[PDB]
Amino acid sequence: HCQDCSISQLCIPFTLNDSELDQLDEIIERKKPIQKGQELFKAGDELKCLYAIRSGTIKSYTITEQGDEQITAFHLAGDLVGFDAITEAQHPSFAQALETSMVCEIPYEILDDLSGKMPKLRQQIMRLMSNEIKGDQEMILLLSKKNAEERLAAFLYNLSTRFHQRGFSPREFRLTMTRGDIGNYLGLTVETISRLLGRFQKTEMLTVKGKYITINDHDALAELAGSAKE
Amino acid sequence: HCQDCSISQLCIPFTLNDSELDQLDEIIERKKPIQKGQELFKAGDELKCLYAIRSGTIKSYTITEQGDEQITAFHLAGDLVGFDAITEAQHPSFAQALETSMVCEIPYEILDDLSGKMPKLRQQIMRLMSNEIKGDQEMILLLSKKNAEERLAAFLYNLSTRFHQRGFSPREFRLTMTRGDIGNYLGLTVETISRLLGRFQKTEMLTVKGKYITINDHDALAELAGSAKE
Numbered sequence: 284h285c286q287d288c289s290i291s292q293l294c295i296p297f298t299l300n301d302s303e304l305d306q307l308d309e310i311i312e313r314k315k316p317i318q319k320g321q322e323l324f325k326a327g328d329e330l331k332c333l334y335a336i337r338s339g340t341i342k343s344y345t346i347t348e349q350g351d352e353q354i355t356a357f358h359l360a361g362d363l364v365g366f367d368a369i370t371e372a373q374h375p376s377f378a379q380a381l382e383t384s385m386v387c388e389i390p391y392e393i394l395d396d397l398s399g400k401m402p403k404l405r406q407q408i409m410r411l412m413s414n415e416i417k418g419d420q421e422m423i424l425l426l427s428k429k430n431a432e433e434r435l436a437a438f439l440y441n442l443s444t445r446f447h448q449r450g451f452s453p454r455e456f457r458l459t460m461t462r463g464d465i466g467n468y469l470g471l472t473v474e475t476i477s478r479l480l481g482r483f484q485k486t487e488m489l490t491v492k493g494k495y496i497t498i499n500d501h502d503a504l505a506e507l508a509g510s511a512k513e
Numbered sequence: 514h515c516q517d518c519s520i521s522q523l524c525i526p527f528t529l530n531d532s533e534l535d536q537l538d539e540i541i542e543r544k545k546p547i548q549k550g551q552e553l554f555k556a557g558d559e560l561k562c563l564y565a566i567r568s569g570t571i572k573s574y575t576i577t578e579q580g581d582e583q584i585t586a587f588h589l590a591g592d593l594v595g596f597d598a599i600t601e602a603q604h605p606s607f608a609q610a611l612e613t614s615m616v617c618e619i620p621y622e623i624l625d626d627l628s629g630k631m632p633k634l635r636q637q638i639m640r641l642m643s644n645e646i647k648g649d650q651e652m653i654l655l656l657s658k659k660n661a662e663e664r665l666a667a668f669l670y671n672l673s674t675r676f677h678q679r680g681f682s683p684r685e686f687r688l689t690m691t692r693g694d695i696g697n698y699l700g701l702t703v704e705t706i707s708r709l710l711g712r713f714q715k716t717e718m719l720t721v722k723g724k725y726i727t728i729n730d731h732d733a734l735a736e737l738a739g740s741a742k743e
């Protein structure tokens with residue numbers, strides 16, 4: 284159940300000859316679905332497999348000394364979860380599903396075994412890590428230079444894009460995560476998150492119905508997202 | 514000039530048989546020293562080599578739409594600069610030396626060529642990326658959950674540690690970067706940066722003379738760094 288995949292283009296078997304493909308799936312792709320709110324691993328757990336998101340939504344977080352969750356990323360289908368566990372065979376982070384999700388469990392060593400063995404695989408694994416790094420860098424700029432109007436716009440631009448790539452309307456999409464969770468990730472207040480979407484709707488940039496977002500003006504939206512100003 | 518290196522333990526030829534070692538250096542390790550303020554690459558440049566810091570200090574940054582520098586990391590000896598350029602053969606970031614620095618130019622393709630060829634190398638390259646990701650995650654928590662007292666303490670804890678590993682006093686070390694740059698990275702004010710070091714000195718935790726920092730109480734310091742509170 285893995286040669287079949289409409290996101291393999293952005294997932295892990297990207298640019299594999301059909302021999303590489305029929306081989307990989309043999310060692311992954313089969314985990315009775317993860318339920319909304321259940322975890323894939325706890326911080327401190329040993330690294331065994333990495334997780335490719337087949338369907339659904341997953342957040343990554345930690346807990347502060349004083350006990351608050353802080354979200355470090357949301358994951359969409361095609362995303363790989365577990366990279367930060369490679370350095371030390373161990374998960375520093377939590378991961379939890381936000382909705383019923385399908386997840387492909389890829390055994391790290393076995394994948395590592397087959398990567399030295401596979402140039403196009405090895406290379407693909409690389410840029411995937413490269414890209415998480417790139418993303419995290421963008422997050423850092425978001426939290427230093429962008430104000431709340433911008434942070435949210437950026438966040439919403441990002442999702443919209445990513446859904447586009449995973450073959451969806453760039454126009455319309457639901458927030459699977461809660462407003463609480465969005466505010467967490469973005470250093471904003473559920474109070475503020477809401478207020479902003481108001482303004483966004485007020486300008487006809489955005490239409491908002493429950494958890495469903497509609498973008499009526501990508502150009503406006505990108506201007507706010509790409510600002511980084513005060 | 515590369516089998517000789519008192520930081521190879523944390524640099525790139527970590528866990529290489531002496532055949533792997535004598536081989537690698539042949540393709541790197543020789544760039545007439547980078548001067549304080551000169552750049553290694555401009556955002557948008559093509560990926561050719563990655564850069565291992567042999568000596569000195571290097572910052573990574575971008576420029577906002579409205580034209581402000583934002584620093585995404587400081588690099589010490591042993592650190593590899595360029596990972597975020599792998600996804601798309603291209604540097605999204607700038608890199609600039611903060612003091613006269615020695616830099617080992619490692620050709621990416623050639624290094625990639627020899628990595629599929631080398632299990633222990635490939636694996637080492639992995640965790641290095643894994644670790645940048647991990648670091649960036651910590652930065653994200655710093656910018657969301659930590660206040661200024663904590664941000665600085667954290668930052669200073671981090672440097673102190675990293676100098677320790679690179680074989681130095683954990684006790685005492687200079688800030689090579691400017692207070693401006695520290696404040697940039699940390700979302701703080703040169704006004705605030707200074708005030709804090711005052712308090713830090715006031716409590717005898719820290720002794721501060723010009724650019725030189727002395728930690729008299731690592732335990733205090735780590736408590737503030739590891740807080741993430743308000």
Ligand code: SF4
Pocket residue numbers: 284285286287288290291294295296311312335336337361387
């Ligand atoms: S989501 Fe699962 S089945 Fe699809 S390409 Fe990724 S690992 Fe394979």
Ligand code: SF4
Pocket residue numbers: 514515516517518520521524525526541542565566567591617
């Ligand atoms: S700093 Fe330069 S010489 Fe030293 S191990 Fe790294 S690449 Fe080799």
